[PDB]
Amino acid sequence: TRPANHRQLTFEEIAKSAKITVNEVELLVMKALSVGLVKGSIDEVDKRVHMTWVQPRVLDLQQIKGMKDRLEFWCTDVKSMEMLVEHQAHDILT
Amino acid sequence: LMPYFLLTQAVRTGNLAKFNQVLDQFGEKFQADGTYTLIIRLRHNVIKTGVRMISLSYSRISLADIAQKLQLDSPEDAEFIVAKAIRDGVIEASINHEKGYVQSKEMIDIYSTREPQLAFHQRISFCLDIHNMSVKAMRFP
Amino acid sequence: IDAFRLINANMMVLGHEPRQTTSNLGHLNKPSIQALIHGLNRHYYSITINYRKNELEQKMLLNLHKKSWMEGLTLQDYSEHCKHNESVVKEMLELAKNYNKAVEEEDKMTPEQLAIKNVGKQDPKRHLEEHVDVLMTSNIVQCLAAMLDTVVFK
Amino acid sequence: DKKFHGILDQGEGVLIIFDEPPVDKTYEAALETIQNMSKVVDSLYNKAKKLT
Amino acid sequence: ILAPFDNEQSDLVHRISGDKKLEEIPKYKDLLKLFTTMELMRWSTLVEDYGMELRKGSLESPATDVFGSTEEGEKRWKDLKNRVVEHNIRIMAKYYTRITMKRMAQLLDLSVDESEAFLSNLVVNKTIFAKVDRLAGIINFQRPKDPNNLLNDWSQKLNSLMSLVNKTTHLIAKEEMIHNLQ
Amino acid sequence: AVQKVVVHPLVLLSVVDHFNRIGKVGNQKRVVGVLLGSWQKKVLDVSNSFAVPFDEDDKDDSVWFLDHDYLENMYGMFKKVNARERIVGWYHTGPKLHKNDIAINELMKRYCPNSVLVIIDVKPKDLGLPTEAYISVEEVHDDGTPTSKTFEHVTSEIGAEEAEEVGVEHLLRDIKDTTVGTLSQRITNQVHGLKGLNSKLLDIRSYLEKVATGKLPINHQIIYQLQDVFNLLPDVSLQEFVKAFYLKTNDQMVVVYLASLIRSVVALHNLINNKIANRDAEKKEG
Secondary structure, rough: OOOOOOOEHHHHHHHHOOOOOOOHHHHHHHHHHOOOOOEEEEEEOOEEEEEEEEOOOOOOOOOOHHHHHHHHHHHHHHHHHHHHHHHOOOOOOO | HHHHHHHHHHOOOOOOOHHHHHHHOOOOHHHHHHHHHHHHHOOHHHHHHHHHHHHHOOOOEHHHHHHOOOOOOOOOOHHHHHHHHHOOOOOOOOOOOOOOEEOOOOOOOOOOOOHHHHHHHHHHHHHHHHHHHHOOOOOOO | OOEEEEEOOOHHHHHOOOOOOOOOOOOOOOOOOHHOOOOOOOOEEEEOOOOOOOOOHHHHHHHHHHHOOOOOOOOOOOHHHHHHHOOOOHHHHHHHHHHOOOOOOOOOOOOOOOHHHHHHHOOOHHHHHHHHHHHHHHHHHHHHHHHHHHOOOO | OOOOOOOOOOOOOOOOOOOOOOOOOOOOHHHHHHHHHHHHHHHHHHOOOOOO | OOOOOOOOHHHHHHHHHOOOOOOHHHHHHHHHHHHOOOOOOHHHHHHHHHHHHHOOOHHHHHHHHHHHHHHHHHHHHHHHHHHHHHHHOOOHHEEEEEEEHHHHOOOOOOOOOOOOHHHHHHHHOOOEEOOOOOOEEEEOOOOOOOOOOHHHHHHHHHHHHHHHHHHHHHHHHHHHHHOOOO | OOOOOOEOOOOOHHOOHHHHOOHOOOOOOOOOEEEEEOEEEOOEEEEOOOOOOOOOOOOOOOOOOHHHHHHHHHHHHHHHHHHOOOEEEEEEOOOOOOOOOOHHHHHHHOOOOEEEEEOOOOOOOOOOOEEOOOEEEOOOOOOOOEEEEEOOOOOOOOOOOHHHHHHHHHOOOOOOOOOOOOHHHHHHHHHHHHHHHHHHHHHHHHHHHOOOOOOOOOOOOOOOHHHHHEEEOOOOOOOOHHHHHHHHHHHHHHHHHHHHHHHHHHHHHHHHHOOOOOOHHHHOOO
């Protein structure tokens, strides 16, 4: 659910989202790393976890619209930065 | 050079009336060369040399100590040159006007800043020019 | 290649010169002396040829043979490229020490002599501009290709 | 004596220990070329500046 | 279990596994299961389930070889303790970044000074790297300075990305040819 | 199973001439022929080919023909005239992956075990490499059918050879991009491959045409990679990824700054080498 900007949740949020105490979520996430459903790292003193990879799920005809528009302005970025190269190095090779 | 070399001796120092000890000794010599009107305004550049000199040396210095070292005779505008030192951009850091100390932050990684490439890009493009001028001036035979 | 065809040895007996040149197209390519040692030109002749070329084929061997896909949108052994930027420069010091040597023995014996004499050992001067091309294109490519992935990839 | 490197504290005796081989190869082995090349331009005076 | 850690031990668990007739003992099928898998129950929660079966069965004499000579037992009580106090420290280096000193000693059920003697003789053994502290209690695992590995691992992620965007492209164009071919 | 394939430019060309020889049919014909080669060291090699007579009618397009006697005797001649050579599989002219190529491969797998196919191009326009090859894998698996079999692309490139490199480089004699210096990379993959990434961004834009309107099978195994790409989208510019980037620019440019400094001195030593040949001949010669 979280974006790729942070995806860095805390242990207190799991204590809210799973109503389980603080002294068991570390035992929980070490199981989750062992099975292979998630790939991330665990801090203990700043009480946060750096999740990096999550298991791919399925999605309906609405999340493709998210992959529609997030893909679409990545087209012009490949266009824009290349347009310098065919203009600035044009005489270097015709 | 000896009257004029003694002038820039005062500039590399931070003393204030050392400028006055030159401008009475050789104030007549500068008017013979016809240059006095540029000489008279060096006191702006003496004080910006000094405030860069003191702020880089001392980290947390009282504003009621810098004036006695620059023989400024007044702490009440010793805040104020530092205000124009930040307005011009000589030193960055803050002044505890309630207490009296002027703290300065320690410098950080200037190596991993873009600015040494600007020391390069002036000279990358310049050194390719003189290689081109060595080509353009060679094959006259 | 040089395709051939026979001529009659009966007309070689006649001493008569065949083939009755009527166009300014035959005597363009000269035969080798080694083929002239053999039966040319006493029993056969040469033929000028060319090649039938067309967009049917010429476009599709050019734009099919020397092509690549990722060789350039990728980086190059990032901890070792900067390491290779010392593997050349280190001996480039002492190669410049030879360039701090060889110019110093000029205003001397007539540098046409400085061509025949220096054929046992390597000169600085030509070798010293050799690495400058290498130490440039290895850097300017790898610096530019890294600074596009910052823009394109997020 | 640089047999070990670190820092010593005076208030409570805290030894902040750190290590890095910083870099030496890239700059000073490229710095000495510059003073080699300075002597080459000096030796250009003995075939150009005197001569033409 | 009792062998020191090695790559030879890392497939020794596989050489003894894959045995149809070893798993007839329900205890010892779980014993090697514990050390292939994740974090172990501490030491006390295991010995209450496994420090009692060494009498039972029809199998007691190599366990009597553990029990009988008590100085051989003391070498084998503590080396069994040594492998399981180590089994935490492998994976705590692998899956944690920065843990407190008090938290680790609690998962070992022993003194904080006794914890420091454990991490001392493993990193002068340099088989687990660690940079501990004795003022904030803040230790950390696999934390070098990293000057060059940032952009190096970043360049790795480009090539993994660019190999994947080529995977889908020649997989879409066939998928349109199984619905609208003719 | 197979690392990669190696294609010579002869067999690349030895389909085009047959595509000319059947080009007088006008209406529709795909060139299908027998591919010969010798795979060694887990690397697929392709050497020689011909084409077998093959026709196709559009109504009930499951009716193909391979005149196997033409396959028997001509390979028997080719096994005679080159016993090093053998069968390696087959090919077809491959515009758009026609439907019969699901059992053509199963028709003639009794000769080659890994009967590989090759899709070529007859009208070249791309920015990639216009030779494609698949492989045969089958599955009693996840969702589709009890009998399921789908082709998978093993990577493809045009191998060269010391004999044929003499030929093709004589046969080009055309516009070339030789003298690889600072500029060949700029145009082989900096002008070009950035636009090569266009048609792959735009390719997954073409599958995206089914949001509510396109074809009826929806996703299931297409989006696990697309979920990963936005997940494996690279790191943002906040960390020492900013700082260590300025670090190496502050190292890579120093080598360029030294190397350009050398370039000025060398041509200056060349300048005196022309002032030695200018002044010391005008008094001598005149």
